[PDB]
Design an enzyme around this catalytic site. Sequence first.
Site, PDB file in Angstrom:
ATOM      1  N   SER A  89       0.814  -1.224   0.000  1.00 55.44           N
ATOM      2  CA  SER A  89       0.000   0.000   0.000  1.00 55.44           C
ATOM      3  C   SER A  89       0.842   1.266   0.000  1.00 55.44           C
ATOM      4  CB  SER A  89      -0.920   0.079   1.226  1.00 55.44           C
ATOM      5  OG  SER A  89      -1.593  -1.142   1.535  1.00 55.44           O
TER       6      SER A  89
ATOM      7  N   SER B  56       3.330  -6.879   2.279  1.00 56.90           N
ATOM      8  CA  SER B  56       2.090  -6.376   2.886  1.00 56.90           C
ATOM      9  C   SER B  56       0.874  -6.676   1.963  1.00 56.90           C
ATOM     10  CB  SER B  56       2.226  -4.885   3.212  1.00 56.90           C
ATOM     11  OG  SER B  56       1.259  -4.452   4.129  1.00 56.90           O
ATOM     12  N   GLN B  57       0.186  -5.630   1.518  1.00 56.02           N
ATOM     13  CA  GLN B  57      -0.970  -5.823   0.594  1.00 56.02           C
ATOM     14  C   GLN B  57      -0.652  -6.726  -0.622  1.00 56.02           C
ATOM     15  OE1 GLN B  57      -4.666  -3.749  -1.947  1.00 56.02           O
ATOM     16  NE2 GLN B  57      -3.345  -2.351  -0.707  1.00 56.02           N
TER      17      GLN B  57
ATOM     18  N   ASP C 145       5.392  -6.899  13.514  1.00 58.36           N
ATOM     19  CA  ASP C 145       4.431  -6.871  12.418  1.00 58.36           C
ATOM     20  C   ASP C 145       3.244  -7.703  12.880  1.00 58.36           C
ATOM     21  OD1 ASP C 145       2.989  -6.997   9.996  1.00 58.36           O
ATOM     22  OD2 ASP C 145       4.762  -7.475   8.798  1.00 58.36           O
TER      23      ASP C 145
ATOM     24  N   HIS D  61       7.177   1.408   9.649  1.00 53.90           N
ATOM     25  CA  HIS D  61       8.571   1.172   9.247  1.00 53.90           C
ATOM     26  C   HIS D  61       8.656  -0.010   8.321  1.00 53.90           C
ATOM     27  CE1 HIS D  61      10.235   3.864  12.402  1.00 53.90           C
ATOM     28  NE2 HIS D  61       9.070   3.575  12.955  1.00 53.90           N
TER      29      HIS D  61
END
Length: 195
Positions: free
Chosen positions: A29, A108-109, A163, A176
């Site tokens: 993202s 991530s995404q 995370d 971060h």
Amino acid sequence: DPQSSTRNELETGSSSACPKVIYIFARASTEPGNMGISAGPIVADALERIYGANDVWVQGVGGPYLADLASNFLPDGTSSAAINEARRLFTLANTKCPNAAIVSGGYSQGTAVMAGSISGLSTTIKNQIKGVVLFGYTKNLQNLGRIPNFETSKTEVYCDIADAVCYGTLFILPAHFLYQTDAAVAAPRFLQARI
């Protein structure tokens, strides 16, 4: 190393010059281009120095994958449009270069893009995907550490302890970048060993 947030080497690649490795990547993202500026190019650089830039096509998942914040919250953790674009690039890799080793990654995404696209691919195309690296896999706990219908042996999840999205927590935009080492060292070695 030059940092290229937009890589389109599969898109523009010629079926007369198929590389040994095709590397497809879905960014996090807010990241620019179709590679982003963190794990994407780090892995790109790391692979290109294992096999030579000539013998690796580097491809981002761009176009309709906009990498917006809202899509993280949808059931799949990203948009159908993004998933379908990634499907389209995997198919294009198999179509253009059926004998090339496909490897891919997501941060991530981009891990939800990878999970959602790869789970739907043919036996043939899945067999062409030799290795997949998922940094900060946002559906890690939900998907039981794997991509549905894709060999767990060919799949590596990277989670940092800072995370919480890796471990069931609802999505937050990472403050971060946590995967410098995983992207630079562990991941390209995992992929190389599957090529």
